[PDB]
């Protein structure tokens, strides 16, 4: 979910940028930045609601799910071998050759957890004016404006990943301090013509356990998957408009049932009454 929403299904509204961003329009001066929400790649999230399990309240304990391992894979690398089409050609002096493939800054993050990903706000210039609708920024959560400390690290610009497609990846990064029931992996590769690189495999798997051998216990009963897979840009022909590109990510989570200690004194419901 990077820019163009999936709702206008017809491939005539714009050529159906679903899977791509809508464009990019640089600032007109130092202070004038309005990034037009359908331009910003955002976080993808989903929550699989697992069933209820046993409870053993006669002596305090409880059963809950436990994400033991994960096989993930970005699907659709070979589709970037589409070198026909109306993109900027490789020989522009004659407008001939190859329609340049997807290149540029890449950003691959995924995260498997028992509770939504905790995010932290960082930005380039904090004078950027993001729209106040359809997107979640640092002003939406800290009701005041953005300050200079939001350019480096503000321990008050925190959030969760509850929504989907609303937290742009250029503002909200996975929180290192907070995430305890979440294993997140990521990597960024900047540049302007950096060739993409992907590897897919049926075999190798990630282990989500920690040094105590637990792994994300699914709180409530849900299991939260989050991801962002930005593969580069696409330079059109009339001007150098620079739509983003993103590929889907396949998750396969292996979970089991673990006996834990019930934290809350459920008798405290009388306190709720009180």
């Amino acid at each position: 979910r990077m820019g163009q929403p999936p709702t206008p299904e017809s491939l005539t509204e714009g050529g159906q940028y679903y899977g791509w961003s809508r464009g990019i329009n640089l600032a007109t001066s130092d202070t004038e930045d309005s990034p037009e929400n359908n331009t910003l790649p955002t976080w993808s999230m989903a929550k699989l609601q697992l069933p209820m399990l046993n409870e053993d309240l006669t002596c305090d304990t409880l059963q809950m799910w436990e994400a033991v391992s994960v096989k993930t894979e970005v699907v659709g690398s070979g589709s970037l071998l589409d070198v026909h089409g109306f993109n900027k050609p490789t020989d522009t002096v004659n407008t001939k050759g190859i329609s340049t493939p997807v290149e540029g800054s890449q950003y691959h993050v995924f995260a498997v957890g028992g509770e939504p990903l905790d995010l932290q706000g960082l930005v380039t210039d904090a004078r950027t004016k993001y729209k106040e609708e359809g997107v979640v920024t640092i002003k939406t959560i800290t009701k005041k404006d953005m300050v200079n400390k939001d350019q480096v690290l503000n321990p008050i610009s925190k959030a969760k990943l509850d929504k989907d497609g609303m937290y742009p990846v250029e503002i909200w990064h996975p929180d290192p301090a907070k995430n305890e029931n979440t294993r997140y992996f990521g990597n960024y590769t900047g540049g302007t013509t950096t060739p993409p690189v992907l590897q897919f495999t049926n075999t190798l798997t990630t282990v989500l356990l920690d040094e105590n051998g637990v792994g994300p216990l699914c709180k409530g009963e849900g299991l939260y998957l989050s991801c962002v897979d930005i593969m580069g840009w696409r330079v059109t022909r009339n001007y150098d408009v620079h739509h983003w590109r993103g590929l889907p990510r396949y998750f396969k989570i292996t979970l089991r049932k673990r006996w834990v200690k019930n934290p809350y004194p459920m008798a405290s419901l009388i306190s709720s009454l009180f």
Partner: antibody
Amino acid sequence: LKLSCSASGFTFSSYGMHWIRQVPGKGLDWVAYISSASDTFYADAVKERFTISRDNAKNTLYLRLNSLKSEDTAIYYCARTRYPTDHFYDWFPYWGQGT
Amino acid sequence: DIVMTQSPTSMSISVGDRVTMNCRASQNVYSNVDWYQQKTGQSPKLVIYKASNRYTGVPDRFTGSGSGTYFTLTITNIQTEDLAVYYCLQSNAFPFTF
């Protein structure tokens, strides 16, 4: 109170459309703009009153007027940008007829 | 908002002569300036787009030049069909101004 600009001969939803008004003696005056990915940009003196929109699959702009219309009266043209981009600045050469 | 000021408010000239109309913008517009011709009773025709090119069908007497804060439109030998008003438009930030 609600304008209309029907267009034909191209793919309507891929181009950006401006509304420009001209008072017969004061020259031309820009009013509004809506791009392919519909996002409205108005002029400073007309921000809260007009609402420019487009309705794809019917190929029509709709500049819903002030709903008050106190001191705004002129010939209203529509203009289409030259190229089918998401670039906001495209030197619209295809003006309308006027209304 | 950017304000565009044109130096020749009204110039009287004959056929075969040269005219040059200039435009100054408050802030910087890099190369996004268009030159429009309007004859009385017609929709304004585009003449010089992006301050340095001639739109299709426009003769070779028209010339757009300049970049930054000072733009200019020149006609070497006037024609009878060149008797219209001429505006310059900045399309470099919103809102656009003529």
